[PDB]
Amino acid sequence: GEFEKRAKELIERAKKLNTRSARTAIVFLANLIATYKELKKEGNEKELKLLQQSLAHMQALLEQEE
Amino acid sequence: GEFEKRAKELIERAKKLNTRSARTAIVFLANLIATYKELKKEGNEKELKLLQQSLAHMQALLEQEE
Ligand code: NA
């Protein structure tokens, strides 16, 4: 999975805070996975990098939270 | 609006990318507005700050694209 696996690890990790904000991050990260799978089929590497960056920003918001 | 108008500023710039990844940022930006308005009515202010931070990461992710 690579991108998906780190996002799902963030989905799990965030799922244990059970708040409103976090249920907004979970929905978003789920959408990043779905968008990532399509952009990989499309071969759009600039946007794949863009989403990888978004994944590393969400990790630094949900690392400080927990 | 404080949070909302800047989120709308990020929505505006994301729409001028006309990319698949930007429609995920816009969708997510609308969800942040709705979630922000919600807990703002509760006075749950620790989470409003967290959403403010997520908006400022979104602001620094969309800045490379243009
Ligand atoms: Na979203």
End-to-end Cα separation, chain A, in angstroms: 24
Task: Count up the domains in chain B and report the number.
Answer: 1
Token pair, residue B38, equals: 């919600």
End-to-end Cα separation, chain B, in angstroms: 25
CA nearest to B14, candidates B49, B66, B57: B66
Min Cα separation B61/chain A (Å): 7
CB contact A21 to B (< 8 Å) = yes
Which method was used?
X-ray
Q: Nearest CB to B38: which of A20, A27, A51?
A: A20
Q: Which chain A residues touch B10 with a CB distance below 8 Å?
A: none
In DSSP notation, B47-58 reads HHHHHHHHHHHH
What is the SS3 string spanning B29-45?
HHHHHHHHHHHHHHCCH
Task: Give the C-alpha separation, B29 to A17, whole Å.
Answer: 21
Q: Which chain A residues touch B14 with a CB distance below 8 Å?
A: none
Distance of CA B41 to the CA centre of its chain: 18
Q: What is the resolution of this structure in A?
A: 2.4
Provide the CB-side half-sphere exposure for A8 (13 A, CA).
Answer: 8
- Structural domain that includes position A61: 3-65
Q: How far is CA B15 from CA A5, A52, B24, B54, B64, in A?
A: 28, 20, 11, 19, 14
Token pair, residue B14, equals: 């994301």
